[PDB]
Amino acid sequence: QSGISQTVIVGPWGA
Amino acid sequence: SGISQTVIVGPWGAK
Amino acid sequence: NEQSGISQTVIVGPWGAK
Amino acid sequence: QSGISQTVIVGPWGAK
Amino acid sequence: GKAFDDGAFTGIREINLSYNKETAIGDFQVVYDLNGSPYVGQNHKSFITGFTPVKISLDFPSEYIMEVSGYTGNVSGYVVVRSLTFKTNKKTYGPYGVTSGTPFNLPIENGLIVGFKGSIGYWLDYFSMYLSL
Amino acid sequence: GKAFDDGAFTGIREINLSYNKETAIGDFQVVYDLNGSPYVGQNHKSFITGFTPVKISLDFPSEYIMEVSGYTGNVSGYVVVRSLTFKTNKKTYGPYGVTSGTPFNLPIENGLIVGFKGSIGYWLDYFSMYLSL
Amino acid sequence: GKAFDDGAFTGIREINLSYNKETAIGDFQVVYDLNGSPYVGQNHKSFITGFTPVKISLDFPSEYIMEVSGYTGNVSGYVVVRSLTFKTNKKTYGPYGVTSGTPFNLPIENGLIVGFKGSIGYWLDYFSMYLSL
Amino acid sequence: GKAFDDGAFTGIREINLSYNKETAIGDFQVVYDLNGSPYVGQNHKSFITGFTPVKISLDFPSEYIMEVSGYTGNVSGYVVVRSLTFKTNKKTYGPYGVTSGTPFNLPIENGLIVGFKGSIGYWLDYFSMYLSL
């Protein structure tokens, strides 16, 4: 694992 | 409370 | 339950004076 | 990224 | 329609639905993963018949859904989900149902779909998805 | 355009964006909540100016966004985010921009938007949202 | 010992464990909540028998565990969990077993225990906990 | 003592604490990571002098804390945190202070420490940690 916290991400919408 | 939560997206469709 | 707009995080502790 | 959900795990206690 | 809520799990192994191009999505059932083991969800059935069956068997855990899209529209006066498409990191399944009506799409950049809820009468009325890391 | 990524915070206090009624969304900036205090986000600006600014000040923490919707479409040959609407548990803000093209909508039943990332050139090219409990 | 890993669930409804006053903790089993319904966890059993069973029935969802503690020490050449105490927001269950050795305590300020993993041979060797909102 | 709560962030870059080899932990401060930028937390100071400072500089993001352990115990009659040790995936920092009293330890199998809160008077009275994926 890395030392960076993660989060759910939805998208992208657009180009 | 004692119930675990989860992110929920929607609904899509009828109201 | 009604949610507020404040994000939540697990917290463990405290260790030390109770 | 795997198709398996994860969660925080603390421990172990008792030994290792 | 009759409401349903499967709840949240560890991931997704297979999706079984049915559809009719003249109308909308009909039946919906999911085999989830629950900590390593297949969890057979309840079959949520349409009140009527005449649908074409579809089975989406995912190569879990290597394969997982990256985007869910579809169309909502009127059928016999009711607003229902007329079409659905499931894209994974390996292949695209769908569309099932005609792609007409109001579109919607949920692409996932980080995270996983871990559960479904909704309502089905003659057709799938509406649905929501549980998301998690 | 120029890509941007604010990352994730603990909530949203204010959104400051700009748009043009004939084209699309322009600048985008967020005042996030970070552990109970305001955190002033970087202002992501269009390669051009001449937009109408809008300030959406939320009654944090009791007021929060429950649905983000809008339209994507062509403007001078490229796809951009043409319109945006933010619906909270108390009020609706928008539509801002041009409501034509392909609609999209992200309703949230449980959880919160805690960050934005995307790209802005002349207009907002695309965007994604961080979701958390 | 034989390693075990229940995985993660929605909450905890009951814990069924056994212990012996002459030694340490033996069998361990959990009845979890899975989306509002009970889910019977695997019973993780000691290589030997003769323990005293105990059932901890929690008033789910209003009652939940806020701190887990106990003692580790040597029993017949094995370093094991000799005692466990579960404190909820309503009351305290335990200590069960022998309260001598090196202490350990996991106090939870925010969040919930949603699963257990570990190893059991003649006695409970070690264990970890899944924590979630 | 005086209470403090840094809050939750994206990770940890450095810890600056002071200790006394005859009493306990004194000053405590942390440089966190906030979406890629260092976030310099405020220095929480002991009410007295005489401590030895130490700088724990982690190689973020490849290096991260896997276990926090130490001792709490009486000093001048009341309970305080007397010693601390920080184990990362690359090496061990400490023990700092006096290793006497009641031990404690928080090993992490999955997840990260993303924040600290507690209280400091003549010495560190107590502390808690924020955990996240």
A13 touches F at CB < 8 Å: yes
Nearest to F111 by CA among B7, B1, C10: B7
The residue behind tokens 């949240």 is E8
Cβ separation G109–C11 shorter than 8 A: yes
**Whats the size of chain C, residue-wise?**
18
Searching chain C, which residue's CA lies closest to the CA of residue H71?
Answer: C16
Per-residue DSSP letter, H26:
E
Structure tokens at C12: 């463990």
Q: Which residue of E114, E118, E132 is in closest CB contact with B11?
A: E118
C3 touches F at CB < 8 Å: yes
> If DSSP codes are grouped into helix, strand and coil, which group holds residue G10?
coil
Please tell me the distance from the alpha carbon of residue H132 to that of residue F122, in angstroms, as a whole number.
37
B4 touches G at CB < 8 Å: yes
CB atoms within 10 A of CB E124: 30
Nearest to F106 by CA among E84, H127, B8, H91: B8
Query: E83, E99 in Cβ contact below 8 A?
Result: yes
Per-residue DSSP letter, E44:
B
Query: H117, H42 in Cβ contact below 8 A?
Result: no
Searching chain G, which residue's CA lies closest to the CA of residue E8?
Answer: G35
CB neighbour class for E85 (10 Å; exposed up to 12, middle 13-18, buried from 19): middle
Q: How far is CA F21 from CA E77, F51, F119, in A?
A: 34, 9, 20
Contacts of H49 (CB under 8 A, 6+ apart): none
Please tell me the distance from the alpha carbon of residue C15 to that of residue H51, in angstroms, as a whole number.
21
Query: F86, F93 in Cβ contact below 8 A?
Result: yes
| Chain F partners (3+ C-beta pairs within 8 A) | A, B, C, E, H
Q: H38: cis peptide before it, omega within 30°?
A: no
Tell me how close the Cα of E103 comes to any Cα of chain F, in angstroms. 7
Q: Could you tell me how far CA H45 lies from the centroid of its own chain?
A: 13
For G131, list phi and psi in degrees, rounded to 5. -120, 140
Which of G9, G10, G108 should one mutate to test binding to chain B, selecting the residue with the greatest count of B CBs within 10 A? G10
Contacts of G99 (CB under 8 A, 6+ apart): G71, G82, G83
For F31, list phi and psi in degrees, rounded to 5. -100, 105
| Chain H partners (3+ C-beta pairs within 8 A) | A, C, D, F, G
Structure tokens at C4: 């507020």
Q: How far apart are the first and last CA of chain B?
A: 28
| Chain E partners (3+ C-beta pairs within 8 A) | A, B, D, F, G
Searching chain E, which residue's CA lies closest to the CA of residue F102?
Answer: E103
Please tell me the distance from the alpha carbon of residue G22 to that of residue G98, in angstroms, as a whole number.
8
DSSP string, F116-130: EEEEESSSEEEEEEE
Tell me how close the Cα of E59 comes to any Cα of chain D, in angstroms. 10
Strand pairing class (E37-40; E25-34)? antiparallel
Tell me how close the Cα of C17 comes to any Cα of chain F, in angstroms. 24
Q: Give me Rg for the CA atoms of chain C.
A: 13
Q: What is the resolution of this structure in A?
A: 1.8
Please tell me the distance from the alpha carbon of residue H10 to that of residue H31, in angstroms, as a whole number.
11
Per-residue DSSP letter, H77:
T
Nearest to D10 by CA among G59, G18, H99, H69: H69
Query: F52, F11 in Cβ contact below 8 A?
Result: no
Q: Which residue of F10, F110, F111 is in closest CB contact with C6?
A: F10
Please tell me the distance from the alpha carbon of residue F36 to that of residue F41, in angstroms, as a whole number.
15
Q: What distance separates the 2 farthest-apart alpha carbons in chain F?
A: 43
Please tell me the distance from the alpha carbon of residue E112 to that of residue E105, in angstroms, as a whole number.
15
CB neighbour class for H107 (10 Å; exposed up to 12, middle 13-18, buried from 19): middle
Q: What distance separates the 2 farthest-apart alpha carbons in chain E?
A: 43
Contacts of A9 (CB under 8 A, 6+ apart): E108, E109, E110, E111, F117, F128, F129, F130, F131
> If DSSP codes are grouped into helix, strand and coil, which group holds residue H34?
strand
Q: Which residue of F5, F6, F35 is in closest CB contact with H8?
A: F35
Alpha helices in chain H (DSSP H): none
Q: Contacts of residue A13 in chain F, CB cutoff 8 Å?
A: 70, 72, 81, 104, 106, 126-128
The residue behind tokens 């041979």 is G121
> If DSSP codes are grouped into helix, strand and coil, which group holds residue H43?
coil
Domains of chain F from N-terminus onward: 1-133 (2.100.10.30)
- Helix or strand (DSSP H, E) at F72: strand F65-75
Cβ separation E63–D6 shorter than 8 A: no
Q: How far is CA G42 from CA D14, E21, G50, G109, in A?
A: 21, 45, 20, 28
Query: G122, G76 in Cβ contact below 8 A?
Result: yes
Please tell me the distance from the alpha carbon of residue E104 to that of residue E85, in angstroms, as a whole number.
11
A3 touches F at CB < 8 Å: no
Please tell me the distance from the alpha carbon of residue E133 to that of residue F111, in angstroms, as a whole number.
13
CB neighbour class for C4 (10 Å; exposed up to 12, middle 13-18, buried from 19): middle
Q: Contacts of residue G111 in chain C, CB cutoff 8 Å?
A: 9-12
Query: H63, H89 in Cβ contact below 8 A?
Result: yes
DSSP string, G62-119: T--EEEEEEEEEEETTEEEEEEEEEEESS-EEEEEE---SEEEEEEEEESEEEEEEEE
Q: Contacts of residue D1 in chain E, CB cutoff 8 Å?
A: 64, 110
Contacts of E49 (CB under 8 A, 6+ apart): none
Please indicate the experimental technique that yielded this structure. Answer: X-ray
Surface of F (71-110) touching B: CB under 8 A:
105-110
DSSP string, E60-127: TTT--EEEEEEEEEEETTEEEEEEEEEEESS-EEEEES---SEEEEEEEEESEEEEEEEEESSSEEEE
Please tell me the distance from the alpha carbon of residue F111 to that of residue H113, in angstroms, as a whole number.
22
Query: H133, A5 in Cβ contact below 8 A?
Result: yes
User: Given phi > 0 = left and psi -120 to 50 = alpha, else beta, which region is H109?
Assistant: alpha
> If DSSP codes are grouped into helix, strand and coil, which group holds residue H38?
strand
Amino acid residing at F37 = S
Structure tokens at F31: 């005042």
Query: A12, E114 in Cβ contact below 8 A?
Result: no
Structure tokens at G25: 């903790």
CB neighbour class for H14 (10 Å; exposed up to 12, middle 13-18, buried from 19): middle
Q: How far is CA F46 from CA F3, F14, F82, F122, H77, in A?
A: 11, 19, 14, 5, 63
Searching chain E, which residue's CA lies closest to the CA of residue G41?
Answer: E35
Q: How far is CA F82 from CA F100, F126, H95, in A?
A: 7, 10, 58
Tell me how close the Cα of A9 comes to any Cα of chain H, in angstroms. 14
Tell me how close the Cα of C7 comes to any Cα of chain G, in angstroms. 11
F15-48: burial string, b at 16+ Cβ within 10 Å, e else: bbbbbbeebbbbbbbbbbbbbeeebebeebbbee
| Chain C partners (3+ C-beta pairs within 8 A) | F, G, H
Structure tokens at G108: 């939870």
Q: F38: cis peptide before it, omega within 30°?
A: no
**DSSP E strand boundaries for chain H:** 2-5, 11-19, 25-34, 37-40, 52-57, 65-75, 78-88, 92-97, 102-110, 112-120, 124-132
Structure tokens at G124: 């409970």
Cβ separation H117–C11 shorter than 8 A: yes
Cβ separation E10–D2 shorter than 8 A: no
Cβ separation B10–E128 shorter than 8 A: yes
Structure tokens at H68: 């926090």
> If DSSP codes are grouped into helix, strand and coil, which group holds residue G51?
coil
A1-15: burial string, b at 16+ Cβ within 10 Å, e else: eebebbbbbbbbbbb
Structure tokens at H21: 């080899």
Angle at G4 between CA G3 and CA G5, to 5 degrees: 135
Please tell me the distance from the alpha carbon of residue C4 to that of residue F11, in angstroms, as a whole number.
10
Query: D10, E19 in Cβ contact below 8 A?
Result: no
E58 touches D at CB < 8 Å: yes
Which of H10, H35, H133 should one mutate to test binding to chain F, selecting the residue with the greatest count of F CBs within 10 A? H35
CB neighbour class for F129 (10 Å; exposed up to 12, middle 13-18, buried from 19): buried
Q: How far apart are the first and last CA of chain G?
A: 31
Angle at G113 between CA G107 and CA G114, to 5 degrees: 170
Per-residue DSSP letter, G48:
S
Q: Contacts of residue E114 in chain D, CB cutoff 8 Å?
A: 5
